[PDB]
Amino acid sequence: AATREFIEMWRLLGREVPEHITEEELKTLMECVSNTAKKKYLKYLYTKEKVKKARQIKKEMKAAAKNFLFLRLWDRNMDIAMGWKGAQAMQFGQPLVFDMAYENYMKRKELQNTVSQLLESEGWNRRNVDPFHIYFCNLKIDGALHRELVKRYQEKWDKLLLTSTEKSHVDLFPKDSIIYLTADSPNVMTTFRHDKVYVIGSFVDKSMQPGTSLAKAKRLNLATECLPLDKYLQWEIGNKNLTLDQMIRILLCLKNNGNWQEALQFVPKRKHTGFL
Amino acid sequence: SVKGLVAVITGGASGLGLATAERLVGQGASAVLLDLPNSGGEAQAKKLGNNCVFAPADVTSEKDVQTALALAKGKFGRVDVAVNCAGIAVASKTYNLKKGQTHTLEDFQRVLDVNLMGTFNVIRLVAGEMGQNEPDQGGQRGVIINTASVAAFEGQVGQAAYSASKGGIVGMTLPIARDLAPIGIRVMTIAPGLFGTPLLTSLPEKVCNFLASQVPFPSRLGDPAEYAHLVQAIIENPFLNGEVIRLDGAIRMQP
Amino acid sequence: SVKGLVAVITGGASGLGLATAERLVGQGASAVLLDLPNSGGEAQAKKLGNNCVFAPADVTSEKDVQTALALAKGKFGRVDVAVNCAGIAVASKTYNLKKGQTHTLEDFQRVLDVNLMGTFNVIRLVAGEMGQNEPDQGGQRGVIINTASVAAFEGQVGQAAYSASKGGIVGMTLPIARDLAPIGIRVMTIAPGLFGTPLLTSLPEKVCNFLASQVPFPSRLGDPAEYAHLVQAIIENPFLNGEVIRLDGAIRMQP
Amino acid sequence: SVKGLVAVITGGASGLGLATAERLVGQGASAVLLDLPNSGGEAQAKKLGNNCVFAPADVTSEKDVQTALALAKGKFGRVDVAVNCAGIAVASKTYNLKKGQTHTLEDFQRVLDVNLMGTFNVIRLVAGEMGQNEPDQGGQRGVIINTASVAAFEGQVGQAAYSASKGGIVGMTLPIARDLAPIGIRVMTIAPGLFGTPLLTSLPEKVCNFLASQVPFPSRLGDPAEYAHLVQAIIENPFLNGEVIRLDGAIRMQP
Amino acid sequence: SVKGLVAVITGGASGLGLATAERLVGQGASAVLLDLPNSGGEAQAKKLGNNCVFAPADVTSEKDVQTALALAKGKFGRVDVAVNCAGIAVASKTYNLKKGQTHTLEDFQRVLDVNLMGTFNVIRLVAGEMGQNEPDQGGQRGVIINTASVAAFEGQVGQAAYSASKGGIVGMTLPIARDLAPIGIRVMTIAPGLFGTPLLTSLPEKVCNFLASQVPFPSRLGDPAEYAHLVQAIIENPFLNGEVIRLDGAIRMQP
Amino acid sequence: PTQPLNSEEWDKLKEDLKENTGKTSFESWIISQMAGCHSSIDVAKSLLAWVAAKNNGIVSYDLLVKYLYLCVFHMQTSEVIDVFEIMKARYKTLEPRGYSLLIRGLIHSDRWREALLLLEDIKKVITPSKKNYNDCIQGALLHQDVNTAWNLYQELLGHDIVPMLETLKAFFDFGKDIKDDNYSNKLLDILSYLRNNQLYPGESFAHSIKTWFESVPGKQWKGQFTTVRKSGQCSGCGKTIESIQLSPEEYECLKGKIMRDVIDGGDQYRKTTPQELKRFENFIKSRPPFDVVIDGLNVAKMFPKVRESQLLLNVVSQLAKRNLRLLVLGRKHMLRRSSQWSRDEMEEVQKQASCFFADDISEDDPFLLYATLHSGNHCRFITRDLMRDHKACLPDAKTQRLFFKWQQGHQLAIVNRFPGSKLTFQRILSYDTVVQTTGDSWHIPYDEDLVERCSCEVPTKWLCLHQ
RNA sequence: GAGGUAAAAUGGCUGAGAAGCAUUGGACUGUAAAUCUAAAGACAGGGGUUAGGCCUCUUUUUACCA
Ligand SMILES: NC(=O)c1ccc[n+]([C@@H]2O[C@H](COP(=O)([O-])OP(=O)(O)OC[C@H]3O[C@@H](n4cnc5c(N)ncnc54)[C@H](O)[C@@H]3O)[C@@H](O)[C@H]2O)c1
Ligand SMILES: NC(=O)c1ccc[n+]([C@@H]2O[C@H](COP(=O)([O-])OP(=O)(O)OC[C@H]3O[C@@H](n4cnc5c(N)ncnc54)[C@H](O)[C@@H]3O)[C@@H](O)[C@H]2O)c1
Ligand SMILES: NC(=O)c1ccc[n+]([C@@H]2O[C@H](COP(=O)([O-])OP(=O)(O)OC[C@H]3O[C@@H](n4cnc5c(N)ncnc54)[C@H](O)[C@@H]3O)[C@@H](O)[C@H]2O)c1
Ligand SMILES: NC(=O)c1ccc[n+]([C@@H]2O[C@H](COP(=O)([O-])OP(=O)(O)OC[C@H]3O[C@@H](n4cnc5c(N)ncnc54)[C@H](O)[C@@H]3O)[C@@H](O)[C@H]2O)c1
Ligand SMILES: [Mg+2]
Ligand SMILES: [Zn+2]
């Protein structure tokens, strides 16, 4: 009512606000504590609207604009082959853990972004020649991460060739085999060991309190390692923390007998100047 | 008809053997559940009725199988059918270059002894008691049905030993049929696909669901009652001899 | 059970097809004998009962099979089972060096057209018919059972064309089983050996007796009633699909 | 050794036939490329030198094959080897319930007529030609090598007719070997998997990469040069007869 | 080519293994006979020359095979091919009613061990040995070629144990190929028919002459040099993997 | 343009300047520049008339808001009223800049009670800025309505907003007219707020305070602009300014809120392991209080041209000669011999001092803070670190200001810039610069208008007021 | 294995100051599925702020002080 008129008067003045707003997101706006939070949420809605209408316009543009051996059924065949390899990985694949205990240290924005990165990481893993066997540890059934994952995967969640457990990776695997990957680790990863379970924190860190993964690894005595980014790259900008999908791609490249340069090809080019 | 016949089902306390025993005892036949003492054979035998008797035995052992056959003869006086549904499975790759792991020879030998040597032990010891039967009209004294697997034709990764044992059963099916044809015993083999039994408990549940979804039709795990139906059909068909039947729903396994 | 099922038996006037029709009708099903005008199927259809009708048709032609299937739909309203038992036999050597004689291309063409092409014609039109049936509790719409020969595997001198056609049937059994899996139709094959029908009996009687003696066990020619028994077994087992069953008594042919 | 022999390859102007002709002419054998007039057989024959000749012909036509064999006699005075590689492929689903679409009988018939019937026509006529050869030390007059596919064993959705043709060749491989054993001619069959020929190399890059990844090892499409290698190995081994060899790299075709 | 390759031939002192060793050493390769101390492989290794060495081993025992592979590595530094030709044969009927005789479990166990368990033991140790090789262009590390008679497919009266062992080898050929595909090892199997070796000539001579007359073409028994030819062909073909080749001259055995 | 234009003039100007206009429309761009350069309202009115004529009497909201800005900047109340009527007629609710400009313009007119309604209308979705409250308070004070002014001030403080010093200056400037005890006590409340929140009046605000105090009846205040002598005594009277040391209650709560927050912030594994906490705590309670608490790694790393142990030994010996009881925090890796570190010099350190070595992965600074605080007020610590991060991880702002005061009082920083020179520490003030009372006397720092400051250093001038 | 100061920060990757290439769930696709459909779009994270601008505190990165 009044709010939906303030937002229109801001739209008229050239402010970054959504053209159309709905009731649930109006409630979300009113749940923002301060003026700056309201401005940020409104800008987010505005850019969502821009991108949605741009892609819809592109949809309209696209709409306006013998002896064979195989029927063209290629996508289904690829999916089924990936499923066979995923089952084989479940049986004889190397474990790769994703710790889901950071749900307390994340607000909604970074929780949703974490879910997106998890989806992309799993997608990259499925396509590989020798997939890992993935674990989602400390994933609480009633948690927010579980809800978002069962909302993004939908009815594929129960058909996913990975282990989802509400227990800890210190209970599923031997304590001495676990290596916990974190950028704050004093120790560096010289080589990829094939007998070690690697634990990646499903955590987009946008808090100003650093070293949470290291605290988790210390509370339960575990080995820690970090990628040798500084040794192999001329870092210029950006934090050393990499997205989960980049981490899994690097680990997959290393797993399939890849050198460190080929593996680190997945580090963003904007963050480093070149290779050494 | 199976009415009045006596059947010796090895590994009859669980899964496919138990289903076959249930169907046969429901059709009026008598059943001997030859199985390990550790299994729940006693409870199943009591449940089935007075026509079912449990024999604690190890198919790998000559003395145990001889004692079980003696019990069957004493109780019912003869043996008419022998079902070999006793076996074990293992999941180990021949060699793993990344992990530097090699298949254990004891694992291979254990699987080969239980699956392949126990079947032959039962076959050879049961042919003796079948030979004592007077030929029926047509000259048939008994029927032997062995359980192979589809791993004998397309085995999976980490299924080398199991595939070897099942391929051995498939290979010896016909030579034994020719051996026993002079005296009138039919030797048959069944190669089931994926069936819902305790044997599949080792696999992860999601892997089992994927494999069930990969069966062309019906897209589900097999039902032991269906294996029992095929067993009865083989028992009642005089002209089925020395052949392997794939009860797998048209599934062809992939690596 | 087969009670209430509607079956279309190709070549059902005589031989294995007639035996299958007799058994299915006796068990409570309904039968359509799809056969040639001069086969004499009208008398057999009268003999079986009111539940058996005779459809004149030549499997080699679309129109005849379509008319027969329309007749079946009109008479009974559903098609649940199909049994391909029509075929012909030809004996001729590829080349006689002594006699300077070469196999005829017309013999190969006609044997291939009747055994292999007619089977596909019937399969595809009957699959179109079954696609209209409501799925059963198991999702099944029908069953197709082709007839092959052990010549598909161990053929004999003079059986180049017969072996070719039967091997084609055996080869195409699985592709079709995968094609029709989404619909819910099960496709199976039976490969009999030396059954007592006019096709075999047309050979020299001495050869008939010798072949009867060659069978390991039972040491006799097959009984079409046993073929019908196996056909019913395939019908009643949900989990048999895309497989070839050898109903031959453990016989393997010599050159 | 193949030095001095005369080979007749059907479909010799492209793919596997061209590779076989290339290898055999390189090793010193004379070659006749029996192929359609519209293909590029003349250019290939010119490239291969004076030891290679091109014969326009249709394997489905008896007169064309007879003229090609007469040309081979005129040019080289003898026929020692025959390689049947000429065939076509057709992909078409047996029945599509959602689309209400049925397989066309003309597609099935043309696939059969080219592959299976042309193979048999060439086999019989070339056997008649080889019969005129004086026996070699060891009693051999010639060798015939047919091409098949793994579709004959496991066929993918839409490969009913192609699977039927390949399975027919596989089925008739042994009967013809037994027929021609008195004459002294060996008959063998090769079952390629996925090969880098114009059938496959024309497909998109993504699907080519997928198919290459499907082969267990080597994880690539086959090279016709090593099909020619296998053909030469068959020619050089007197004791390979009436057998099917799978040159597929351990790939089992997915549903 | 095979020049510069290191081949470990089990049972290389006698028959097929010895022929393979001779051919490979004559083609420029190196050979490590792996046989029992009493076989007399020292003399044959001396006869071949300085590219052949002898290793006293019992394939049934892990330590002996490990020591033999260590000897091969020390002598030549590398293992490229492994030809598994060791085996024994037993002729005993499963059960004899007139004679009241039963197959002994000891004979079955001994044959099974030596043929199947020893073959698996050698395969699993040589796979670890070959894992050390640097892949060549194409990614190939090694080749393993097992021997498994045609008794795997059709076994004669009294070959129950031999048929079981060879069927086991044939059954596990493909699982092991899929297991070792990532490593880049090709696993192939040869299935010879009747060959002229001590094993064959042991049994009554006129029976052997009859059996030779039963081979369609060439009638004469197989020649081990031709087994060696086929082994070399398998070594030189990159795309032969996970297949069983019958080298028997088209003979199909009878009861 | 500098003079009102005709419609044809506007059109030809549009044709010429559409080249420069760029992305936005001509009229919006031209009025934007006019607002930027403060054009007279007649020119803008002419532009709006031309736009409306072209657009059938409809002038966009943005143009009308920028015109409102122009006619509020030039203190033209009549056009502000007219624009207010136009806004009310055409729109049912306005935008916060529109509301802000309307409030800023309406405080002057007679219709100044409507600006409060506009403020309430803003309050619906957003918290009004500090300037909206400032303008409403000034409008209420100009019309002799003090109850509403104090209500608005109290609402401002209720929304946790820091009032702009202009508003407090306004209260003090208007206070002269009134002679009431309640108003004087409220002004003293404003002074106490200044004291609590560490805010310093501006020079004009200082003069306003001085005048208000001097105008009080009965008690003849005397005001002076002075400075504080190094010994913590202002020149005006010689009285001693308040001490920089913390009050005992404040010191206790700061010990508590540092232990429970900076060290074991509910985890006890992030900074250090529980074993190290227990060990350090036992070690501290074993030794009697200390006089200095050195940070070994900070004082060793100062000069890169000297070995770390060498610098540590030099500093420790120079502090030892003074008879001070030392405490040398550090890390375990300091003990193990290296090129940088040598056992001889570390043994000299452990005979001259009393050391404590933590794990190489633990954080030293919190241990430094707690050792110093546990010792007592007399204790001091040697470090160049400013400890911004540890101050950040404190619950609220009051605790952070307490920490900053204590840090000023007790931190010693090495100003020395070469190893050879003698050890000298940056000066530590003995007194705190803050608005303060001594019964009657009032001492109030302030900032000089024509200077610049930093949050590091604190005002030098003072205002001394004696009853 | 510690600090001070100043510039920088795209959480799938490139950009522009727009946009392309990707990602997730569905579609048994007749060979441009080179598709069609839904899902996800916060330029480091918090507070403020101008007529238009941009400031401020934390975290991180880099380069200097050296
Ligand atoms: N999915 C399947 O179940 C499946 C698929 C293919 C083949 N098979 C074969 O079917 C047979 C039975 O399958 P199942 O599902 O019923 O198995 P199961 O694991 O349920 O059978 C358990 C039974 O086996 C008996 N047993 C095992 N080893 C024995 C031994 N050495 N001596 C005596 N008894 C022994 C146990 O006592 C117990 O009664 C096995 O040969 C199996 O390999 C089964
Ligand atoms: N010994 C055996 O009986 C034996 C062995 C192997 C395979 N088979 C196969 O079994 C099937 C049944 O043969 P059978 O034993 O009944 O022999 P049969 O000779 O009695 O079969 C004759 C039947 O085929 C029908 N028929 C032939 N050509 C036809 C056509 N073009 N259209 C329609 N009907 C046609 C006739 O009308 C008649 O009903 C055949 O496919 C046969 O090849 C039989
Ligand atoms: N990937 C493969 O190449 C593959 C896989 C399995 C089976 N096969 C079979 O291998 C054979 C050859 O494969 P290819 O890739 O070389 O094929 P291709 O398509 O490259 O062969 C083309 C040649 O076939 C000849 N040809 C076709 N039909 C003919 C006819 N009726 N009469 C005469 N000549 C005729 C043409 O004239 C031409 O020379 C075919 O039977 C094919 O189905 C090949
Ligand atoms: N006619 C044939 O020769 C024929 C036919 C089919 C299959 N085969 C198979 O071919 C292989 C070899 O045939 P062959 O004619 O050379 O047989 P053979 O009997 O001549 O082979 C004897 C060799 O086997 C070795 N050997 C046996 N057991 C051994 C063990 N446990 N450890 C090590 N060495 C052992 C002996 O030392 C000797 O070198 C066997 O697997 C056989 O079954 C042969
Ligand atoms: Mg610090
Ligand atoms: Zn004073």
Author numbering:
A (entry chain F): 92 to 156, 175 to 385
B (entry chain A), C (entry chain D), D (entry chain C), E (entry chain B): 7 to 261
F (entry chain E): 115 to 581
Could you pull the original sentences from the published paper?
Human mitochondrial transcripts contain messenger and ribosomal RNAs flanked by transfer RNAs (tRNAs), which are excised by mitochondrial RNase (mtRNase) P and Z to liberate all RNA species. Mammalian mitochondrial RNase P is evolutionarily unique because it is a multisubunit protein complex consisting of PRORP (also known as MRPP3), which is homologous to single-subunit PRORPs, and the two additional subunits TRMT10C (also known as MRPP1) and SDR5C1 (also known as MRPP2). This multimeric complex carries out both pre-tRNA cleavage and methylation, and is thus a central player in mitochondrial gene expression. In contrast to nuclear or bacterial RNase P, mtRNase P is not a ribozyme but comprises three protein subunits that carry out RNA cleavage and methylation by unknown mechanisms.
To investigate the mechanism of mitochondrial pre-tRNA processing and methylation, we reconstituted human mtRNase P and determined its structure using single-particle cryo-EM at an overall resolution of 3.0 Å. The structure contains TRMT10C, four copies of SDR5C1, and PRORP in its active conformation. The substrate pre-tRNA is tightly bound, with the methyl-acceptor base 9 flipped into the TRMT10C methyltransferase domain and the 5′ end positioned in the PRORP active site for cleavage. Human mtRNase P adopts an elongated structure around the centrally embedded pre-tRNA. SDR5C1 forms a rectangular, symmetric tetramer, as previously reported. Its dehydrogenase active sites are near the binding interface with TRMT10C, and each SDR5C1 monomer has a NADH cofactor bound in its dehydrogenase active site. The C-terminal methyltransferase domain of TRMT10C binds on top of the SDR5C1 tetramer, with its active site facing sideways. It is anchored to the SDR5C1 tetramer by the adapter helix (TRMT10C α4, residues 183–202), which precedes the methyltransferase domain and was not included in the previous crystal structure. R181 protrudes into the anticodon loop and interacts with the C2 carbonyl of U33. This interaction is specific to pyrimidine nucleobases and is likely crucial for correct substrate recognition, as this position is conserved as U or C in tRNAs, and mutations of R181 cause mitochondrial RNA processing defects and respiratory chain deficiency in patients. The methyltransferase active site is positioned directly adjacent to the junction between the acceptor arm and the D arm, where G9 is flipped out of the tRNA fold and buried into the active site, stacking against the conserved residue V313. In the mtRNase P complex, PRORP adopts a more ‘open’ conformation with respect to the angle between its nuclease and PPR domains.
